[PDB]
Amino acid sequence: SGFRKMAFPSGKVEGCMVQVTCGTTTLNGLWLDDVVYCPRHVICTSEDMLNPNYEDLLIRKSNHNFLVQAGNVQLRVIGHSMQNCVLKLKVDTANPKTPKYKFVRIQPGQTFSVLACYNGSPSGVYQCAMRPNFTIKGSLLNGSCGSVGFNIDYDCVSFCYMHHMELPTGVHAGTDLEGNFYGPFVDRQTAQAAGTDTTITVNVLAWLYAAVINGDRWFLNRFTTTLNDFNLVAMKYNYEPLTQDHVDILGPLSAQTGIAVLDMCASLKELLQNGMNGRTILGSALLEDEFTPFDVVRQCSGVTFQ
Amino acid sequence: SGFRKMAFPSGKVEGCMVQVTCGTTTLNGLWLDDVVYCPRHVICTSEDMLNPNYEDLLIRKSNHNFLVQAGNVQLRVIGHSMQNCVLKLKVDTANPKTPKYKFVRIQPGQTFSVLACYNGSPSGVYQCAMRPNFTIKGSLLNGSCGSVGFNIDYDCVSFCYMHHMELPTGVHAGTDLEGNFYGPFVDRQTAQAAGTDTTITVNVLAWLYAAVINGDRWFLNRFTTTLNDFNLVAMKYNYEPLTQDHVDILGPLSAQTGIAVLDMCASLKELLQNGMNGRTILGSALLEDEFTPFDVVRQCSGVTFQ
Ligand SMILES: *C(=N)[C@H](C[C@@H]1CCNC1=O)NC(=O)[C@@H]1[C@@H]2[C@H](CN1C(=O)[C@@H](NC(=O)C(F)(F)F)C(C)(C)C)C2(C)C
Ligand SMILES: *C(=N)[C@H](C[C@@H]1CCNC1=O)NC(=O)[C@@H]1[C@@H]2[C@H](CN1C(=O)[C@@H](NC(=O)C(F)(F)F)C(C)(C)C)C2(C)C
């Protein structure tokens, strides 16, 4: 029993982290097979970053200009290219700790674990959601660029995020592992801001199913509602719309706990309207929207990884 | 910027996890050097567990009765002993992934990461505090016994917790790595309950310093107070007493943020009395007591591990 914001075990990703230095600038890289991936602004001075021309900056660089350190081993760089906002460095040594892996681009509301690194070394791991405005509520500092976000499926690491920048209000933005930003941001130090954020409704419901699984049931009322009556109320409270795909996805939890997805929607409808009245669900005094249905199932049924 | 409940990177501990089967009963073991440690109730049937005589149960067992599986390798058991509530199994192969490590017993209020495992495989990692009543608010299921809690210091894993049981209200109890329970519990299925829990005051203050570091400052008032005026109020609200050792420990954060420890106590005094008035500190609608001062410093200054 019990419900925590759980991270994926990080060991597979730890074996892939390296430090990448170009001149004065140092950040983290991901070493997979014989390629190191990192954010392209490693090739910028602090001044370049206000208004960089990356293609121009990269012409001036040759392979020996990139210092890649894996522990106390320097990896010899034998090629380099740029793919959108990530730099790819080919090295003459294949990382022997490379796990089976894929590159994926995730959807808003999906979760992943971030392995926060500095100088190629891990500082910690935590669970994050891609927010509907395409930010993540991270804990990331100077030097953390190149830290990656990931899921594990059995023995396979799906890398979905590489960290690039912090935005106003202390939220974070980055790219998929092809260098393509989540959201309309660019890797340049100029005034930018996230769109107004919104609550991931399918995740709140999944969290409510987890509460039921763990014996938190005071918020259950005796009502149903159609998808229309609920989504109408949700729009006003700035809640993302709930689709029938979401209902289908919530299915396994609905069948497990004996509560139809629409009955949970009825219960949540009341909660939003009437407030929690000083009580807590799973020890939180706020509706929680950063657990996907599969996160709840993986947590509550003990799913492991190899 | 940003503040998350962060776990230690788990890779070092992952390399130590194995599965230990005795007859029908299976749970997790920790393989360090040529010894596997696990909870001693692996030698119990379900019926034995209501009222076990462990010494009696263990006489009946020889080395070949313990199936230890490390991945797809069976480790040959060549010795076994019992040390309080943990069983130690000597195997003929030293774990080549054994990190530098120590066994420590932690104090109430101290934090650690739990690597939750089933069948010798990791399911996830999360941060936990030893509660003042000697429980932990875990997320742990059937088969999770043998999962361990730990800290990392540079390159050294300090193992502080081995998981044994769940108590009423869905909280968890276990031993240090010498088999000695935290708190007055015993490894037997009979009615037991945790003492009434209490809020770890030095941790709340450390969390308030983290909020200040990250720009959350609305709860700061213009008052001081002596340690007596505050601790008197705290007793009523069921807050652990704040000692001068705690003040000395809070020192680095006090000097970093420019707020004397007593001024933070003044601010917290008001918070408890007047409530948060529907606002959130670091995005939480509740005072948070599961970050030690060193957790805040390690998170906010980017401390890594090798
Ligand atoms: C990579 N190591 C850092 C990580 C930052 C640093 C502080 N917290 C983080 O997450 N990435 C950067 O510093 C990027 C980078 C230039 C500047 N930058 C920023 O994150 C800046 N943000 C912005 O300029 C804004 F508003 F656009 F988001 C900063 C003010 C330093 C937070 C480049 C190349 C975008
Ligand atoms: C080890 N794999 C399990 C982990 C438990 C199972 C469900 N959640 C957990 O954390 N450990 C046990 O099942 C231990 C073990 C016998 C029974 N037990 C319990 O945790 C039981 N608790 C108690 O009996 C009580 F009240 F004393 F805490 C149970 C009712 C199954 C939760 C032994 C040998 C103590």
Residue spans per domain, chain B: 14-91, 99-175, 201-299
Q: What is the resolution of this structure in A?
A: 2.2
Position A264: which residue type? M
Of B44, B145, B160, B265, the catalytic one is B145
Question: Shortest Cα distance from B60 to chain A (angstroms)?
Answer: 32
Identical topology for domains B14-91 and B99-175: yes
Count of residues making up chain B: 306
CA of A119 to the centre of ligand 1 (A): 16
Contact (CB, 8 A) for A206 and A240:
no
The answer to whether residue A145 is catalytic is yes
In angstroms, the CA A290 to CA A129 distance is: 6
Q: What is the largest CA-CA distance in chain A?
A: 69
Q: What is the largest CA-CA distance in chain B?
A: 69
DSSP β-ladder status, B156-167 and B101-103? parallel
Contact (CB, 8 A) for A51 and A188:
yes
> Residue B284 in 3-state DSSP?
strand
Contact (CB, 8 A) for A239 and A196:
no
Ligand 1 within 6 A of CB of A188: yes
In angstroms, the CA B123 to CA A74 distance is: 33
In angstroms, the CA B38 to CA A100 distance is: 30
Which residues in chain B touch residue A298, judged by CB atoms under 8 angstroms apart? 123-124
DSSP B142-179: TT-TT-EEEEEETTEEEEEEEEEEEETTTEEEEE-TTS
Among A112, A126, A172, the residue to mutate for chain B (most B Cβ within 10 A): A126
H or E element at residue B14: helix B11-14
Q: Is B249 on the interface with A (CB under 8 A)?
A: no
Q: What is the 3-state secondary structure (H, E, C) of chain A?
A: CCCCCCECCCHHHHCCEEEEEECCEEEEEEEECCEEEEEHHHHCCCCHHHCCCHHHHHHCCCHHHCEEEECCEEECEEEEEEECCEEEEEECCCCCCCCCEEECCCCCCCEEEEEEEECCEEEEEEEEECCCCCCECCCCCCCCCCCEEEEEECCEEEEEEEEEEEECCCEEEEECCCCCECCCCCCCCCCCCCCCCCECHHHHHHHHHHHHHCCCCCCCCCCCCCHHHHHHHHHHCCECCCCHHHHHHHHHHHHHHCCCHHHHHHHHHHHHHHCCCCCCECCECCCCCCCCHHHHHHHHCCCCCC
Question: Is B201-299 a domain of CATH 1.10.3720.10?
Answer: no
Scan for tokens 């500082």, then name that residue: A123
In angstroms, the CA A5 to CA A148 distance is: 18
Region A13-91: CATH code: 2.40.10.10
Query: Domain A99-175, what architecture?
Result: Beta Barrel (2.40)
Give the burial class of B73: count Cβ atoms within 10 A of its Cβ; 0-12 exposed, 13-18 middle, 19 or more buried.
Answer: exposed
Residue nearest to atom 6 of ligand 2 (CA): B142
Which residues in chain A touch residue B5, judged by CB atoms under 8 angstroms apart? 5, 126
In angstroms, the CA A97 to CA A105 distance is: 23
Which of B9, B141, B142 has the CB atom closest to A14's CB atom? B9
Among A3, A4, A151, the residue to mutate for chain B (most B Cβ within 10 A): A4
Method underlying the structure: X-ray
Count of CB pairs separated by less than 8 Å, A with B = 156
Ligand 2 within 6 A of CB of B192: yes
Position A245: which residue type? D
- 8-state DSSP, B183: S
CATH T-level topology, domain A201-300: main proteinase (3clpro) structure, domain 3 (1.10.1840)
Candidate CATH numbers 3.40.50.620, 3.60.70.12, 2.40.10.10, 3.20.20.210; the one for domain B14-91: 2.40.10.10
